[PDB]
């Protein structure tokens, strides 16, 4: 508790204030870009959707997990990942893609012989569909995505700003749309492969409304983490503060007694 | 000090015409206020306010006591004054002046505030009026009172004040306050060392002022005049 | 060993333990202790250092433990005071720094025309609150050829000899050290550093690589390879393999707290089966690129248990 | 309503829509068939009456619902007043690649290339 | 160990890696809270502020001031309790359940209590 | 690309100085990268 | 009420409003207000405490207040800098401790012997910037039968009186008090002492 | 100039300065260098300041540089201690304050009736590891009409003259500035506040409000390094501060502002040197210079 | 400049620049690692790195503490250096390579030597 080091201390906080501060403002601007894409996202997941909504589909399990790479966001990752051991009770054995270290890292912790392959460089951007297309070709590719009896992405939906929610969605497969109750409805012409399509491209369009909504999530938790970081340790400023105080004012004290004493020898 | 007999048994509000102070934080009759803020708010035009309106609304004088002066702004006050015309070369003043500037040696500085405040008590008791007393600065007293202490020779206090500085205050604050007679406020500027409420000249003082009277550099750029921080200046007598 | 300001059982739980490994035969206590007037206190470091110089000075090596400073001056300070002169800085007197400079100066290696004999100084001083800037510490810092940096926070989570790498130097260096032990641990205390550089990173806890994993497994390991129990002292031949086995990375895939069982069973099998080296290691104290061979095949051997 | 981009979604009533289904273009209308059917890459159009607006397109999917509501989504997409030289040179390296799995991509661009040409 | 003996030994010094951790990450918790720390050591944390709670004990002559009536453990009592912690079987209890009660018996029943 | 891509290859053929003010840009940049994953250990890393 | 340090015009109204509440009859005030003499300020509570001896003596009971210590040590820090006794922490005499020990020492019950007769102090400490580890407070603390640790941050949230719970204690009282509310009040104490540290792990 | 315990090495190379730019004719150097007795050290600026108010009495005007008080009350200290006067903060005496009131108190603008002489004064203060609480910077802060402050950090980056803008002030201010310099530069205080307070912002996506402050404020800090030496006469400063303030710099980039300021300022001369000329003699500027250097300006940038 | 002449002085002083810079940044590479930066700055960061090692040198004296062999370096020789590490005509060699070295003769022969 010396006064070099007090200072140095308090200095570091403020520092650290500061940059919490930044993050906080601007997560507000990266909210609001993501906020439009939250909007085109879960508006073409309506004209897709609706279709399925018709012909009711219900539907060696792929579970596809989403989140980021980055930290400093709160508890994402940490109750995306319970979620999904939680679902992950009911079948040992089923396999996993995830989209984002941070969950890759949850539960190659926990469920590590179940994961088959894993992507990186993620919640950095808004996600396009560009990536939500060779996500859904290399999940098609390596993953063998068609001859999977059943499969459910799982993301964190965003309730409102302050709280999120982790979320399940099942998309289902080229046999399991043939085989859909209402499917005699649609006068869709067998000409050549058409189901399998309609699948190849709802788990691209899937995923993305997913990733989307994921992150637009995260944006919101790292948002609120950052904002409580700077009441912390603007709280922490203030202690520090009276106590740098306090040293400085008996450093000049403890100083001045040694000089009185020498003087009246 | 006047005795204990010679006491106001009730705290009284003096009325200064302010609208900002008698709503939000009203000075005590008798009573001491801590003025707050540097230069850039005005406080000179403020503080000939109060010298004008406690002359014209009640009927007392004032006393404007320099304490530990920038030579300088002596000056600048002495002719603004005039400018100003709360001193009157031809007709009559409102204000007497009381300097003891920097330069002069620390004795000096340690007696004008007694010097002024001697001038204002004549006016409460005598006149029997409700009379101002300014005293800037009330802490540039304090650091005077110690470098008088020290080459006294006596052993420094905590943090190097002199071992009489709460006596030191009381003998001075203790003359300004109410009698049946009349009444001496007092409005004090107030420096900071370190920015340190804690350090032992400000708390010392704290233990006397009854409100404060912040005016403040973000209130004057959002063109508000006076530029008294509304949430800030707080007084002890509004209950 | 010079025992200052101690308390008298405190010698004695001591001289017992010297005793309990018949350490005695060859140490001298001397005793000034808590009791004793100030004058005997501040004395006894110099009467011991005469005690010992007659060791260098005839030829042979003498080890002189000051324990501890921070008290003889405490001690030098209650002559003073008391004598009236006037004080220095927290009422030490003004030459408390030309009290220990003069003490810890008295230690040397002699030259082949004086005898060869040396005197060695291990002072030891006490802190408050890890402040090394204070009075006394700074003195005996700036005078003594390094020193060793013992923290309470290492200590509690476990590193004992709570020793601080990153603060603790010898100046002399690796002229002092053994060449097998300086062979095997080539850059040790700087990765040592750059380990706590990435274990620093390790913080943010954002994703790692290989490289930082990588130096992070083998610093923990490290880290773990240095911990010892309080009374056994290891020879050379019993470091050195250790230390080799750690930095060439055989350890690195071993659970951490199995480090522990690893150094015993490995002491055991290198005893048992490769004698041989463990005696050329002593006899020798370098190891010759076959040692280095045999050594390193007789390490693989049994990292596959 | 229901005509989506994942970017930028479009329409909300209409009275005709022509499409560049799987098979062929085709017209849905105030009361239509129930389909399916992929959207090959072309051109498209909205209808209001006697209102004539054409977007071109990536392709995607169509799908005329039961309850009579069209659904169309594509990736991409004004007519003319959006896509000569920016296509032109475009092309050039378009057939380059052709002659190169990597090359197979090209393929890709030669049939979207020339129909777009057609505009 | 050659007092108390090895276990005894171990029990101490694990509890005390235990607590040390959890101070040095009481910066870290103070700005960013829990949800920062890794998977280790939000363990570590949770543990330790219960190995925390239970270092706490009623005493009988400072009755006036619990009100709950004071508690003696023993020695071999408090080592074995300690080492069932360390070794998490115990994990499942509210950290609650570890303040102000006498040995591992203690805990279980105040838990019971409470999850009622 | 695929067909799950067909019309994201459709859409960068017919996405390449108009429009591409960020938006389209930026849509055609993404900077993803896979790698499989074996017996914990992993395979190789390359771009999505 | 002794009324050390204080102001002459806070005197008159804390007697004005002791007499407004009639409890002027029952109550014997002693002050040595911030004009006065080093040692007035310093003997008062002193005299103030023989005063109220002799209610204790005369088998009644009297409760003395000390307002304030922490400026009745200031003024002995005064005589004792002129006296030129050499300055401990805080610049303050290494008798200040005995001071305030031998004072408090009489605040006291009698036995059936005696009278049964009683005094209680009701000193009070003003700390700085909130700081109960202080050379004189810690000095006090170690010589009262407990402290009641009134916190700012409370009372500038508005919660009157503002008692820090895990930092006020009372040592001989708990044994002192009215049946009836210790039977209603079952561990309150460290209920809510333990329930701030809770509260303080939520935002 | 009073140098106070510096090496006269210093000292007779501060002299080789001033003679290399002729300015030792209006010059007076005291000297009370590192190795003189202490009385000749407290002494010097007391004996120089006489030496000043010569002019000051004279209806003429100095200026005064003590460098520095902090070593002059090293040396009063010296005197004290030794004289066994009794010590206190830092063991200098009680008058430490009263000896630099009365030194700095000298200086002065005089009225009419004495002459209107005037004596400036340019007091250096030694701070350590920043320290404006330590004793004797407190006592003069308290005394003076305000500061430039210097910081090492800002000398690093390469900002020279390394001044916090955000800590300096003078209390006199706006009534001492050429009313030309102060009518393009009301609105430089304003910028470069604006400016400090979005500058972590420093680190992808931000909007254009807060992403043009930095522009602003990146150039305009660049507008105020100046080589050592080469100070710049007035006419020759309002034009590069109104291209600043006024935005004509947000087009260049940052490593140019170097040599922009050079060719415009000899670009100025040659083909606007009637502008200047008005500048540097009216002292203000009219409605139609305003427009002249708009112009002329624009003229520049585009060219 | 006037004793050194201008590059000499503008070399040392975009060095320093550098430097400041990379102390500066500091911050967010603790907090927001050094993922969250500016490419230019990412670079600013990388040459700064390279050149707080170039700085270091093998005393001759220091042999027995480096068992490094003692390098001596001429002054024109290291301001040529530094001038090309500045102008980024040595972006791809490693860290290490300029750790510990004479000239920059010495940052290539290590460089490759090490590659090897």
């Known amino acids: 508790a010396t006064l070099k080091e007090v200072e140095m201390r308090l200095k570091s906080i403020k520092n650290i204030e500061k940059i919490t501060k930044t993050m906080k403002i601007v997560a507000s601007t990266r909210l609001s870009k993501a906020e439009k894409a939250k909007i085109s996202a879960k508006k ?36 995306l990942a319970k979620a999904v051991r939680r679902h992950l009770n009911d079948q040992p054995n089923a396999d996993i893609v995830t989209i984002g270290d941070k969950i890759k890292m949850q539960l190659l912790r926990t469920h590590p012989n179940n994961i088959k392959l894993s992507i990186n460089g993620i919640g950095k951007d808004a996600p396009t569909f560009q990536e939500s297309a060779l996500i859904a070709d ?64 709802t788990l691209a369009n899937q995923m993305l409304t997913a990733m989307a ?42 100083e001045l007694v040694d000089i009185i004493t020498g003087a009246s020898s | 000090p006047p005795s204990f007999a010679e006491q106001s048994t009730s705290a009284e509000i003096l009325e200064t015409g302010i609208k900002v102070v008698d709503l939000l934080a009203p000075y005590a009759r008798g009573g001491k206020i801590g003025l707050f803020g540097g230069a850039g708010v005005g406080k000179t035009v403020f503080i000939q306010e109060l010298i004008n309106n406690i002359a014209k609304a009640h009927g ?25 015309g709360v001193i009157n070369l031809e007709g009559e003043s409102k204000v007497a002046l009381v300097f003891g500037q920097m330069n002069e040696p620390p004795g000096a500085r ?6 002024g405040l001697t001038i204002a008590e004549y006016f409460r008791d005598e006149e029997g009026q409700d009379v101002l007393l300014f005293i800037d600065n009330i802490f540039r007293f304090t650091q005077a009172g110690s470098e008088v202490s020290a080459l006294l020779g006596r052993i420094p206090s905590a943090v190097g004040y002199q071992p009489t500085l709460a006596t030191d205050m009381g003998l001075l604050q203790e003359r300004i306050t109410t009698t049946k007679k009349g009444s001496v406020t007092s409005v004090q500027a107030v420096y900071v060392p370190a920015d340190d409420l804690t350090d032992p000249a400000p708390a010392t003082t704290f233990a006397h002022l009854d409100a404060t009277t912040v005016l403040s550099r973000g209130i004057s750029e959002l063109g508000i005049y006076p530029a008294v921080d509304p949430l800030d200046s707080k007084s002890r007598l509004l209950d | 060993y010079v025992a200052v300001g101690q308390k008298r059982s405190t010698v004695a739980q001591l001289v017992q333990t010297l005793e309990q490994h018949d350490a005695m035969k060859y140490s001298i206590i001397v005793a000034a202790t808590a009791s004793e007037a100030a004058p005997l206190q501040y004395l006894a470091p110099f009467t011991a250092a005469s005690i010992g110089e007659w060791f260098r000075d005839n030829g042979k090596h003498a080890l002189i433990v000051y324990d501890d400073l921070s008290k003889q001056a405490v001690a030098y300070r209650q002559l003073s005071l008391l004598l009236r002169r006037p004080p220095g800085r927290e009422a030490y007197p003004g030459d408390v720094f030309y009290l220990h400079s003069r003490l810890l100066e008295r230690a040397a290696k002699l030259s082949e025309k004086e005898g060869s004999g040396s005197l060695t100084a291990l002072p030891v001083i006490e802190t408050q609150g890890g402040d090394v800037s204070a009075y006394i510490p700074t003195n005996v810092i700036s005078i003594t050829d390094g020193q060793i940096f013992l923290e309470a926070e290492l200590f509690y989570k476990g590193i004992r000899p709570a020793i601080n790498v990153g ?84 350890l690195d895939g071993i659970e951490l707290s199995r480090i522990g069982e690893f150094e015993s069973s490995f002491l055991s099998y290198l005893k048992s089966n490769h004698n041989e080296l463990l005696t050329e290691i002593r006899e020798k104290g370098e190891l010759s690129k076959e040692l280095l061979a045999s050594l390193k095949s007789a390490t693989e051997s049994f990292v596959a248990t | 309503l229901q005509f989506a ?30 389909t399916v059917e992929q959207l090959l890459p072309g051109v498209v159009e909205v209808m209001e009456g006697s209102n004539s607006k054409k977007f071109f397109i990536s392709g995607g999917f169509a799908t005329v619902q039961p309850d009579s509501q069209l659904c169309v989504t594509a990736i991409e997409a004004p007519l003319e007043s959006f896509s000569e030289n920016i296509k032109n040179l475009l092309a050039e390296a378009k057939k380059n690649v052709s002659s190169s799995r990597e090359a197979a991509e090209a393929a890709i661009q030669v049939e979207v290339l020339e129909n777009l040409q057609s505009v | ?44 944390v949770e543990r330790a502020r219960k190995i925390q709670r239970f270092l706490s004990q009623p005493f009988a002559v400072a009755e006036v001031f619990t009100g709950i009536p004071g508690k003696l453990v023993r020695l071999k009592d408090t080592v074995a309790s300690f080492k069932a912690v360390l070794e998490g079987k115990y994990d499942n209890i509210p950290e609650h359940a570890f303040y102000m009660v006498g040995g591992i018996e203690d805990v279980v029943a105040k838990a019971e209590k409470l999850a009622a | 690309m695929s067909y799950a891509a067909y019309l994201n290859v459709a859409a960068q053929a017919i996405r390449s100085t108009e429009l591409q003010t960020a938006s389209v840009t930026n849509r055609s940049q993404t900077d993803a990268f896979y790698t499989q994953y074996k017996n914990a250990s992993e395979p190789t890393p390359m771009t999505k």
Not at chain 1, 145 to 162: C, E, H, M, Q, R
């Open chain 4, 5 to 34: 981009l994942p970017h930028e979604t479009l329409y909300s009533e209409v009275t005709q829509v022509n499409l560049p289904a799987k098979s062929g273009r085709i017209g849905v209308l105030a009361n239509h068939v129930p």
């Open chain 3, 167 to 250: 603060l603790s130097v010898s100046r002399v260096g690796s002229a002092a050290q053994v060449k097998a032990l300086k062979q095997v641990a080539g850059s040790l205390k700087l990765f040592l550093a750059q380990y706590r550089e990435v274990a620093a990173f390790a913080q943010f806890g954002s994703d790692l690589d290989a490289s930082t994993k990588q130096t992070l497994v083998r610093g923990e390991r490290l880290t773990q390879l240095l911990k010892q129990n309080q009374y056994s002292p290891l020879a050379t031949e019993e470091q050195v393999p250790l230390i080799y086995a750690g930095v060439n990375g055989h």
């Open chain 1, 44 to 79: 073409m997941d309506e004209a897709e959707q609706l279709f399925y909504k018709n012909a009711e589909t219900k539907n060696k399990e792929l579970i596809v997990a989403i989140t980021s790479d980055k930290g400093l966001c709160g508890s994402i990752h940490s109750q």
């Open chain 2, 60 to 84: 007392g004088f004032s006393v404007f006591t320099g304490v530990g002066e920038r030579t300088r702004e002596g000056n600048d006050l002495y002719r603004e004054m005039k400018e100003t």
């Open chain 5, 1 to 44: 160990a050659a007092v108390v003996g090895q276990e005894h030994y171990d029990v101490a010094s694990k509890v005390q890696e235990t607590l040390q951790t959890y101070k040095s990450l009481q910066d870290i918790i103070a700005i960013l809270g829990m949800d920062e720390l890794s998977e280790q050591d939000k363990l570590t």
């Open chain 2, 110 to 115: 340690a007696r004008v505030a007694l010097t």
């Open chain 1, 213 to 254: 909504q994921g992150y637009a999530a995260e944006i919101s938790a790292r948002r609120n983490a950052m904002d409580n970081a700077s009441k912390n340790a603007g709280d922490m400023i203030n202690r520090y503060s009276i106590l740098y105080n306090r040293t400085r004012q008996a450093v000049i004290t403890n």
């Open chain 1, 138 to 201: 290399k999940l098609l590719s390596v993953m063998k995505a068609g001859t999977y009896p059943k499969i459910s992405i799982f993301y964190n939906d965003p309730v409102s700003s302050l709280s999120f929610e982790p979320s399940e969605k099942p998309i289902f497969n080229a046999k399991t749309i043939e085989q859909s109750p209402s499917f005699g409805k649609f006068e869709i012409d067998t000409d050549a492969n058409v189901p399998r399509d309609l699948f190849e491209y």
